[PDB]
Structures are given as C-alpha cells and as structure tokens.
Design a protein around this ligand. Structure first.
Ligand SMILES: [Ca+2]
Ligand SMILES: [Mg+2]
Length: 430
DNA sequence: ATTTTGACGCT
DNA sequence: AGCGTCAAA
C-alpha cells in the first residue's frame, strides 16, 4: 500500500533512428529517398549482405541478414547503397559520424546514454520538473504532441490510424491532473512534449527521422519506442503496464530475447511477461539467480532501476573481419597482412578519437575465431597499447596470437583463421 | 557465407 | 584476465 513503490520516480526516453544507415545514404543521394532501398556490405557474394532496409522495402518482405540477390527476388526494383570499403574491409565511418551529429543534438536537451550507433536513452526528470514550473499550471494542448501515441488508448464506449492516435491522445489529455506537479502521468506527458521538441530538432538539423519511447525506466522506454514506428513516439504509462504485459511475449523485453528468456518460458511454463507476477521474488531468484530474479520480479510489474548512464561516447573502438568458408587465413603472410589492415583502420580511428575527445586507449584486445568453432570468438588475448602505431599494434597482436598456430610448418597457419578482431579499450584522459 | 560492431556479467 | 550473453546497423 503506502510503502509499496511503483517505479514512477523518473522520466526516461529512448530515441531510435528509423532505418538509420538507409537514411544516411538517402540524405546523401536524393535518388534513394522515398524508395524501396537497402544498405549492403560486399557485392561479390550473392549481391552483398543487407544490413539496413527502408520501410518501403520492408513492405515487400526485405529484411536484415538477407542476401541482396534474394531481396531482389522479393523486390525487383530494390535500390541498393554499398558500405564503403577501405583497406579490403567494410568501413562504417560515415554512419559513426552521422551518429555523432544526432548524439550532439540530443545532448543539448539532457544527459544521454549512447546505447548503440543509432539509439540513446535520455533522463528527462529534471528537464520535466523545470518545464512544469515554466508552464505555471497551464494545461497541455494536443498541438504539443502531434506524433505521440498513448499506449492502451483509445478505450471504452474512426477507422484510420491518425484518427485512433488523436482519440487516444484526447482521452489521455482530458483525464490529466495538471494541478498536481507530482503526478507521474503529468510528468510523462511533459516528457513527451520535450521529446517531440528533441525529435523536431534532430530532423531539422540533420534530415533524419526517428521514433521514441517515453516511460519511467529504460526497459519500458525501449519497448514503447518500438510500438509505433517509424517517425512516431509512444508514451507507456505505469497504468498501461498490466494490459500491455498481458499478451507481451517475454522475448520482447530487453535482455530476455536470448537464452535467459527461453529458460524463463521453459522453466515456468509461461509465455507472456504479465504471467511473471504470479511468482514470488524468492521463486524467481531460485530459478534465475538473485540478480535476475529480483530484476524479473520488479520488471513484470513495470519497475526497473537501471540508471541512464552519463556516457555519450563509446567505451571501446574496434575493427574486425570474417574470413568465411574457403577464404579462411592459412598462411603467416595472410594473417599478418590482415592484422596490418585492421591496425591501420584502428590507428586512424584512434588518432581521430584522441583529437576529438581528449583520451587515449591503453589496452589492445586481440580476438580470433578458429575454423570449426561454433563460438563467435575462439581466443582473446590482451597487450599494452602504448603508441598509436599500426605497424606496432599489428606486430603486438601477432606476437600475442602466434602461439596459437598448431602447424608444424614454417609459413602455414593451422587451423585456418576465420575471424580477426582488434579492439582498443581502457581509455584514460589525455 | 550475415558482417561489423558495442556493453556488460561471470568466475 | 578470459569467456559468454545480448543487442545494434
Ligand atoms: Ca533504429
Ligand atoms: Mg536502434
């Protein structure tokens, strides 16, 4: 009752760019705008592998991981943009730089946590409080929320999408308690006003559209963000959680999309997130561990406490290349040449990072996959990263992995290498 | 023969 | 330190 917490203390948003790499290429090449389009890496094998897909192309069934030749089978007029290749490998610089454009705009509004190349969490709690004081008890107009969905509404006693959106928004605003600056629902609504402004700024200043979720924590904000895509935002209130979760597959919640989620389904014999409420905290801890158990117990009730970390920059800078099937690296010369290519791209990115961000990486992590392993990485070794020098970095990576060569022969490498990975880590201020 | 990334937990 | 899990384009 009165001491039972409800996880309504914060306002958190998750902003996610729509079909991000596609939008970067469409900004650059107007011929691709408003077209079924995809971004591919490496044309030679089956037309290249698709990594991003415009919504027009998704309507034909084109997806990520599809080979372009197969996507062309689904969408004969599919347009393609290729990832740049440098030093023999795909180079993602253009997308990292576009990401920086968007992150810097978001940072003007509030503290952000960079969650991936195209998404960031936003802690809006303080901005909401300040805006509520500026408003001076003044009601919130639907005009301030032109692209917002209220999850769960309309409800109770129009057949077009925008009509439904406006009906739900009207019901929500009609109900709000604006005279109470401490109402969680009002705080979320002001949060949504701010996110509308943030999203307008992103589009004005970059050309890129995005979707967003607004709720009381990161998991619900991420879930909300995905409910109305593209170019829309969704408010998930605490009160919307019981109905939302009653038919929500467990795997849709962040961190439960893999083995743990599968084990929750199998061990408990349930399918939907809401069904978790019927277990005690200790029961969940017994099956899934203390940390996971407590997390599940609170999360199925819509409560999560993970903070929006103040971190706009990535914590690691990495480069990797797969060598699939018959192209696996089988000679010492091959392994060293590709370590050099990787180290050169890495030196370039590290030098840029040092100039822009006043920091230096101090550890180099080397990872390889050997032919036969189902595991993504077969081996990981580290060494000191003392100079941004590609020849030195490539020499050190070879030195720390050379003893993996089973081969009795001088020049040959066995078992062949199907992956090389260099990652600069452990940044210190400079 | 999705590939190329990034963060974080366990022991 | 090294391995495993989960997730983004
Ligand atoms: Ca996205
Ligand atoms: Mg994303």
């Amino acid at each position: 009752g009165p001491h039972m917490a409800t996880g309504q203390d914060r306002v958190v948003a998750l902003v996610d760019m729509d079909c991000f790499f596609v939008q970067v290429e469409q900004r650059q090449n107007p011929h691709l705008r408003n077209k079924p389009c995809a971004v591919v890496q490496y044309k030679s094998w089956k037309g290249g592998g698709i990594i991003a897909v415009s919504y027009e192309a998704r309507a034909f069934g084109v997806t990520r991981s599809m080979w372009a030749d197969d996507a062309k089978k689904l969408c004969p007029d599919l347009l393609l943009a290729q990832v740049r290749e440098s030093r023999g490998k795909a180079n993602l610089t253009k997308y990292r730089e576009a990401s920086v454009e968007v992150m810097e705009i978001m940072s003007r509004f509030a503290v952000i946590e960079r969650a991936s190349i195209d998404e960031a969490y936003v802690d809006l709690t303080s901005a909401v409080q300040e805006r509520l004081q500026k408003l001076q008890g003044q009601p919130i107009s639907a005009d301030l929320l032109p692209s917002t969905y209220i999850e769960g509404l309309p409800q109770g006693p129009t057949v077009q999408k925008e009509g439904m959106r406006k009906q739900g928004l009207f019901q929500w605003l009609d109900s709000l308690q604006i005279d109470n600056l401490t109402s969680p629902d009002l705080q979320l609504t002001v949060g949504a006003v701010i996110v509308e402004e943030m999203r307008a700024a992103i589009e004005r200043e970059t050309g890129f559209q995005c979707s967003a979720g607004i709720s009381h924590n990161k998991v619900l904000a991420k879930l909300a963000c995905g409910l109305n895509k593209p170019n829309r935002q969704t408010l998930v209130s605490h009160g919307s959680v019981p109905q939302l979760f009653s038919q929500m597959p467990i795997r849709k919640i962040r961190s439960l999309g893999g083995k743990l989620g599968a084990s929750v389904i199998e061990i408990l014999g349930i399918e939907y997130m809401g069904e978790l409420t019927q277990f005690t905290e200790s029961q969940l801890q017994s099956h899934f561990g203390e940390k996971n158990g407590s997390w599940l117990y609170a999360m199925c009730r819509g409560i999560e406490h993970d903070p929006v970390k103040p971190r706009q920059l990535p914590k690691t800078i990495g480069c990797s290349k797969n060598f699939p099937g018959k192209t696996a690296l089988a000679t010492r010369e091959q392994v060293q040449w590709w370590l050099l290519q990787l180290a050169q791209e890495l030196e370039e990115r590290l030098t840029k990072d040092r100039n822009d961000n006043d920091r230096v990486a101090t550890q180099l992590v080397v990872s390889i996959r050997v032919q036969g392993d189902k595991r993504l990485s077969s081996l990981r070794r580290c060494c000191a990263l003392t100079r941004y020098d590609a020849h030195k970095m490539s020499h050190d990576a070879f030195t720390v992995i050379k003893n993996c060569n089973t081969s009795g022969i001088q020049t040959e490498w066995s078992p062949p290498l199907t992956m090389l990975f260099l990652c600069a880590t452990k940044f210190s201020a400079s």
